[PDB]
């Protein structure tokens, strides 16, 4: 849940 926003592969630019 690193990246709240939609565009995240797993759950971030790097998670």
UniProtKB/Swiss-Prot annotation:
One MF term in the entry's GO annotations = toxin activity
GO cellular component, alphabetical, reads: extracellular region; host cell postsynaptic membrane
Q: In which tissues is it expressed?
A: Expressed by the venom duct.
Sites of Cysteine amide modification: 15
- Localization in the cell: Secreted
Domain of life of the organism encoding this protein: Eukaryota
| Keyword terms | Acetylcholine receptor inhibiting toxin, Amidation, Disulfide bond, Ion channel impairing toxin, Neurotoxin, Postsynaptic neurotoxin, Secreted, Signal, Toxin
Question: What are the disulphide bonds in this sequence?
Answer: 2-8, 3-15
Similarity comment: Belongs to the conotoxin A superfamily.
* Its job: Alpha-conotoxins act on postsynaptic membranes, they bind to the nicotinic acetylcholine receptors (nAChR) and thus inhibit them. This toxin blocks mammalian nAChR alpha-3-beta-4/CHRNA3-CHRNB4 subunits. Also exhibits inhibition of D.melanogaster alpha-7/CHRNA7 nAChRs.
Comment text on domains? The cysteine framework is I (CC-C-C). Alpha4/6 pattern.
Q: What is this protein called?
A: Alpha-conotoxin AuIB
Please give the organism: Conus aulicus (Princely cone)
């Amino acid at each position: 849940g690193c990246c709240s926003y939609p565009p995240c592969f797993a759950t971030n630019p790097d998670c």
